[PDB]
């Protein structure tokens, strides 16, 4: 509406303070010695977390100019989380050091626009160095180590995650849920399973819980619900002839079908139970072909060349057995050929490489794992609900970190990789002196993540940093153990992607931010 | 809306004060000499309670940082109540001692994360120690003592509760209601009974108040309302031929069926009364099978290939007698075999262990006890509603305490068990000194519940503790009689579960709380 | 309701200050060394921009009289942006110099109406000089230079845009969208394409992702949607007789027509499917004739003398092949005479030349590019969301700058064109002295854009101005390299249209503003 | 109390370095690494034997300063109450 305007240094100073407030809050949660930050909620209970992205979202400042600086730095932490789900706190630290030094350079009389370019080119060069340093992380011990390091140095977290990734496979789906006990527990689901139970409670086969176990059953898929649509007798009768159980997947099954069905099942004529498809028409219809092909069956195209009666017994899918409860249906193993299993998976590859990425990929891969791999769920122990969210959150960070480490490798932790690369880029130069200073400023900022970790440990950041620089390769300081050695051998590893993303996201916002001459905001 | 941020010691001090305010409110109500807390309600007259959880829920501080501290400690008291329904005041005290000592350790210059690990390791060991100490409470005398101790040393409450648990059984359901008199009274329900009156007021078998007693009745169950679908008479007529009374359970019965029924019943041709099912769709339908199986009858499943007319006299269940009134229907005993009763109970086991837990188990166990055991209701006598709430509240706490004592045994009271276990753990060490101090801090905090009890009695908390520590096993100080002796022999018992839960819940929040470096809250 | 009135100098001073506030905020972003402006909003994330128009739109002042001045100057920046999309910051600067000097003239005892006439006369003469100075930009290198200069001396932007304009042609359409990747990308579309996908997913000719390729298809256009209006069989059969694929464009196609169509396409009867028309009746109907004429087909005018069945195979248009996916339909090349492609284009000239220009031209030219030229889409890379809009914003400025440069030619950059033309007009005299001063003032103001650029550089604007005036023709100062030379040789180019528009738009509003004797506004 | 007194000792060295515009934490760490009279001379920005270089304090002044500092400190540590004239 109405504006308050500041020029040059006055605008940058206020912006810097906003950045410092946001960043200082974020910094205390960086490292094994990192300490928790509590966010005030008026909803039910306060939240205490060591996750940098969560803290950044929450922070808004009373001073409009300072707030604007903080709001812009908020995004780098936000973007880092979006990319790999970890290193958000580290990214914020880099933004803090780049911005502070860059503004200082601007004060010196240098053109910030040139400074951005220096920084941006330095960043591009730094990224290439990170890729060189990055080494594959395919073994279980290394995966555990990244999980352990990511989840505030918890060895158990990394170990459990490593087992999960190993058992489910490369494309498997891993999730984390609240645990009943104080103990961390891993659950693995083998085969094809979904969240819909049986409409006919009455047909219970052996176990209670409403469990339905059909042995060598035929699977029926349809695009229409069945009411008085019981007319499918030659199809069901054919099944009746073989004396085999029938499993039905469709939009819905009505009381008429179930009433007659229950008696047929109860007298032993046919053991048949029906369960509703996954949900939305786009959702269930897409998911039907895979169940059909997996079981060797044929999907009934209601809207096309098929009808309720029209379909021979061979069109039905076959499975060893199924498990049905009120809320869930499990197929033990449908009998289908590998060419069909892979073919269903192969058509999925286009689906995998999708521009949408959010929503489409998450659900779609779940089908993929289920079709040929497996799905794993991790339970987290903790006496209280608040302890539980912190513990679970860190575990998720480790889960994301392992995913990042596998796909793009790992680099030495403790901030050593950024400080080590900075020495390498010492010879980088640009078009003019202002750019050269910008390049140098970016390198200078690289050091900061290392020293924050040490600072949070209540130890002199400068002492540790000087000895670390003096060292070679992966040599660095272990904050937790309070001693010096090879970071990789100690099991402290940062996934390369989070490290890279942190530096690129920090620099990207920082470069433009340092170039701000004029700030525009509302008056009180 | 901007946020207020505090760092380190300033945040921890404010947090501590919030904790102290909440804890001080709770502490005064701890022990035989515990004092009352009055909660102001604009609803009606103010409430007076000695229950710590009730007091904890109410407390919220003007200062946002202090409030945040209190809200976090509020949860330990709240969680304890949810778990066992007692020891909430004791749990809060442990949080008070743990946090005060822990923050002080942080002040010294130690990693809070390490202190928390020390505390957690000590807690895990403490819990295990409690299980060893826990002496089984399988007799009525011990149960009475735990009830009496829970009820702020009210002997009548404890004895009454023991009789209730004894009479109903292990899976029996015990509830407490406000009495219409000044005297405490126990009510026990035998056989199968439900909260539904009779549709036809007109037919009363003999006793007044709508009391219907059918002698050797046949019981009919249905999934249908009856209006102009009276055609079922061949079934009714068959019963008329028999000369036996008919009991009817269905979704509803209307005047056409009721009006014909009334005259047939009025002049003695048939003695038949109809009552509506338990309540909600699958809740009532779920409960129909047990009624019919218990009585040896068959449920007419509309939903299953059966019909209203289709049912023989033999299908109907048989009972010695039933009792009905305007709001209640009771069956003295159905003729059903034990293997079928157990089969119904066995199938209930899945129902027993379920994710829903809250409310589902409460209603589900009601069916369970009703099916083979008994249901007990306790009335509390008080002239005034305010006196009644305090008296009744303590009774419920005692009821929960007995349930906890039966399930997990008991430990010596007066906080002696926690202080006694602490001596055992004096030999517990972690990876480093910071953890060792955390361990030591937890052990130190164990003593506090004992001393708070003594403190409330106007006696030196430290001296009593020193003499109690010098004792063996269950030796301790009895606050009520002001002298030392064997706590178990004096009838002071703490259910193991409440003691265990108190320590675990208190420590879990306390550990996280001491690790707080930054607190964020809204501006004043 | 009530009004505040100010007279003479006080009114002008408040107006001037309002102008100065707006202009000072805008000036900071002018030049290679220009600096960013950050805008705060309650909707999403704060904006960082170097675009003067974006900054101008936001600014509104607390003082009603100052606001009135700022609002009037806001329009010159806005109008310039709307006219050419670039030079908005420079235009604002001219308004600043014109008004400052003009007001000074007002304070000199001069008639403002005459001063305005002098300004207007000087501007008319200046424009003609600009017309003479402009040299056509026809080579790729020069276009790249204008794009690069507009994009704040970013070489990649100029390179990418130069390739695009050359490839799409003069009437082709170039747009910019946010890119998925970090790097900038260019997409070029050949032939005729539209944004509506296929109704039948089942219909995939060969490649996956819903990709359909029909070889030598017959194209059908209709003004109706097919539900149960299935009959068109003799039309369909004729295509079947031919053995060629059929493409259908209409308001809609239903499942009944699609279901039979799917079966028809699978076995081998016909390879045929339909895609929905562009959108609104006038947009789709107006766009139907061109697709039919392009392919040599006839649009079925349900409205006119044509109906469903009434139309043989020859009526249908032809194309070499089409590309169909979920979101788009592409015609590779329709077979039609150029006597008709041009005819569709020729009627378009009235369509191209009209008052609406916004909405109408974008969509209409889009058709034009598709009909005879090419369409290019540019994707913008950036690590972060804030970087992405700044990068993208500048790219649009370059896109518009290149469009302006090709249409009207280019002039030397750095503001040298205006300073050089001012010397030329040094002998222009009006009716009287007051006008002569007004003229002289406009010439004086021309110099300012050059010096503002130098001022942001951290160098003395006056020293550069004196040296540049002393020089000849295109001689000027390069802010980026800090040295003098030939601006054209350097590659610093100003499209004539942005330069001309800036000067005329600034002057038009400025002349009126200096004329003010009294200002009326609401009370504070 | 012991730790408080031992690290309190560091303050004058660090103060010297701080005044000079040098990092006290860095200088002190290296000086600790050395032995005897070895240390950093703020005036010349060099490390070695401070006494040989030309920087030293009498033992009596160093001792007296340290003991007086501790003596006054202990009195403040033990001071429960203060009494003064109104503002
Ligand atoms: N025990 C440790 N010793 C040395 N460095 C560590 C240790 N644990 C973690 N780090 C490092 O410090 C970084 C930040 O820790 P973290 O809180 O997880 O931040 P993110 O939240 O990961 O920025 C890690 O990415 C890693 O390089
Ligand atoms: N007469 C007593 N003598 C010694 N200890 C007692 C006596 N009565 C109760 N206690 C103890 O003090 C604790 C707290 O009493 P209570 O008010 O019931 O708190 P909860 O509400 O149980 O925290 C008991 O759990 C028990 O161990
Ligand atoms: N590197 C440069 N050296 C000299 N002059 C430049 C340079 N870059 C841009 N200019 C000039 O200064 C003007 C303003 O730059 P710009 O920020 O793009 O403003 P607009 O936003 O174009 O007013 C340009 O139109 C051009 O004439
Ligand atoms: Mg991490
Ligand atoms: Mg109690
Ligand atoms: Mg521009």
Swiss-Prot record, chains A, B, C:
Q: Which domain of life is it from?
A: Bacteria
Q: Which residues carry this modification: N6-acetyllysine?
A: 116
Summarize the protein's role: Together with its co-chaperonin GroES, plays an essential role in assisting protein folding. The GroEL-GroES system forms a nano-cage that allows encapsulation of the non-native substrate proteins and provides a physical environment optimized to promote and accelerate protein folding, probably by preventing aggregation and by entropically destabilizing folding intermediates.
List where in the cell it is found: Cytoplasm
Q: Which UniProt keywords apply?
A: Acetylation, ATP-binding, Chaperone, Cytoplasm, Isomerase, Nucleotide-binding
Name the PROSITE patterns for this protein.
Answer: CHAPERONINS_CPN60
Give the UniProt family note. Answer: Belongs to the chaperonin (HSP60) family.
Record's NCBIfam families?
Answer: GroEL (TIGR02348), PRK00013.1 (NF000592), PRK12849.1 (NF009487), PRK12850.1 (NF009488), PRK12851.1 (NF009489)
Q: What does the record note on quaternary structure? A: Forms a cylinder of 14 subunits composed of two heptameric rings stacked back-to-back. Interacts with the co-chaperonin GroES. Can form asymmetrical complexes, composed of one GroEL and one GroES, and symmetrical complexes, formed between one GroEL and two GroES oligomers. The asymmetrical complex is the functional unit. It was suggested that the symmetric heterooligomer may represent a transient intermediate in the chaperonin protein folding cycle.
Share the domain note from the entry: Each subunit is composed of an apical domain that binds non-folded proteins and GroES, an intermediate domain and an equatorial domain that binds ATP and is involved in inter-ring interactions. Forms a large central channel that appears to traverse the entire length of the cylinder with no obstruction. The central channel of GroEL functions as two cavities, one in each ring, that are separated from each other by the crystallographically disordered 23-amino-acid C-terminal segments of the seven subunits. The entry and exit of polypeptide seem to be restricted to the apical end of each ring.
- The entry marks the following residues as binding ATP, namely 29-32, 50, 86-90, 414, 478-480, 494
- CDD domains documented for this protein: GroEL
The gene coding this protein:
groEL
Q: Cite the EC number.
A: 5.6.1.7
Q: Which Pfam families match?
A: Cpn60_TCP1
Q: Which GO terms describe its cellular component?
A: cytosol; GroEL-GroES complex; membrane
Give the PANTHER family listed for this entry: 60 KDA HEAT SHOCK PROTEIN, MITOCHONDRIAL
What is the catalytic activity of this protein?
A: ATP + H2O + a folded polypeptide = ADP + phosphate + an unfolded polypeptide
Which EC class does it fall in? isomerase
Question: What InterPro entries does this protein map onto?
Answer: Chaperonin_Cpn60_CS (IPR018370), Cpn60/GroEL (IPR001844), Cpn60/GroEL/TCP-1 (IPR002423), GroEL-like_apical_dom_sf (IPR027409), GROEL-like_equatorial_sf (IPR027413), TCP-1-like_intermed_sf (IPR027410)
**Name by which UniProt lists this protein:** Chaperonin GroEL
Q: How is its activity regulated?
A: During the substrate-folding cycle, the two GroEL rings separate for effective substrate binding and chaperonin activity. Ring separation is triggered by ATP binding to the trans ring of the asymmetric GroEL:GroES complex and avoids formation of functionally impaired symmetric GroEL:GroES2 complexes. Activity of the GroEL-GroES chaperonin complex requires Mg-ATP. UMPylation of the chaperone by SelO/YdiU negatively regulates its activity, and may facilitate survival under stress conditions.
Q: Cell inner membrane as a keyword?
A: no
């Amino acid at each position: 509406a109405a504006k308050d305007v500041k020029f040059g240094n006055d605008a940058r100073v206020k912006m810097l303070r906003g950045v410092n407030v946001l960043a200082d809050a974020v910094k205390v949660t960086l490292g094994p010695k990192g300490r928790n930050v509590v966010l005030d909620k008026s909803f039910g209970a306060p939240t205490i977390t060591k996750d940098g992205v969560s803290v950044a979202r929450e922070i808004e400042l009373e001073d409009k100019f300072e707030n604007m600086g903080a709001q812009m730095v908020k995004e780098v932490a936000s973007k880092a989380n979006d990319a790999a789900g970890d290193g958000t706190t580290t990214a914020t630290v880099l933004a803090q050091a780049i911005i502070t030094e860059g503004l200082k350079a601007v004060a010196a009389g240098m053109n910030p626009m040139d400074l951005k370019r220096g920084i941006d080119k330095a960043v591009t060069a730094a990224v290439e160095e990170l890729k060189a340093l990055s080494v594959p992380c395919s073994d279980s011990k290394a995966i555990a180590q990244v999980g352990t390091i990511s989840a505030n140095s918890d060895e158990t977290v990394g170990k459990l995650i490593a087992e999960a990734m190993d058992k489910v496979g490369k494309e498997g789906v891993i999730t984390v849920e609240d645990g009943t006990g104080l103990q961390d527990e891993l659950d693995v689901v083998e085969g094809m399973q979904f969240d819909r139970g049986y409409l006919s409670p009455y047909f219970i086969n052996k176990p209670e819980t409403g469990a339905v176990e059909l042995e060598s059953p035929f699977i029926l898929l349809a695009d229409k619900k069945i009411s008085n649509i019981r007319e499918m007798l030659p199809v069901l009768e054919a099944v009746a002839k073989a004396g085999k159980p029938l499993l039905i997947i469709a939009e819905d099954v009505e009381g008429e079908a179930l009433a007659t069905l229950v008696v047929n099942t109860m007298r032993g004529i046919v053991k048949v139970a029906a369960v509703k498809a996954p949900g939305f028409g786009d959702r269930r219809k897409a998911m039907l072909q895979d169940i059909a092909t997996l079981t060797g069956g044929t999907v009934i195209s209601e809207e096309i060349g098929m009808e309720l009666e029209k379909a021979t017994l061979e069109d039905l899918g076959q499975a060893k057995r199924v498990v049905i409860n009120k809320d869930t249906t499990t197929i033990i193993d449908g009998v289908g050929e590998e060419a069909a299993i892979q073919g269903r998976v192969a058509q999925i590859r286009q689906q995998i490489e999708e521009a949408t990425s959010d929503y489409d990929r998450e659900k779609l891969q779940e089908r993929v794992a289920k079709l040929a791999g497996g799905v794993a769920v991790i339970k987290v122990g903790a006496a209280t609900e608040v302890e539980m969210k912190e513990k679970k959150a860190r575990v998720e960070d480790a889960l994301h970190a392992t995913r990042a480490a596998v796909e793009e490798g790992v680099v030495a932790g403790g901030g050593v990789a950024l400080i080590r690369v900075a020495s390498k880029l010492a010879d980088l130069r640009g078009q003019n002196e202002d750019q050269n200073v910008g390049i140098k400023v970016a390198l200078r900022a690289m050091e900061a993540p290392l020293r924050q970790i040490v600072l949070n440990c209540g130890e002199e950041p400068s002492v540790v940093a000087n000895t670390v620089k003096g060292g070679d390769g992966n040599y660095g300081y272990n904050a937790a153990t309070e001693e010096y050695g090879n970071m990789i051998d100690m099991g402290i590893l940062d996934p390369t992607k989070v490290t890279r993303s942190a530096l690129q996201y920090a620099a990207s916002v920082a470069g433009l931010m340092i170039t701000t001459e004029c700030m525009v905001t509302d008056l009180p």
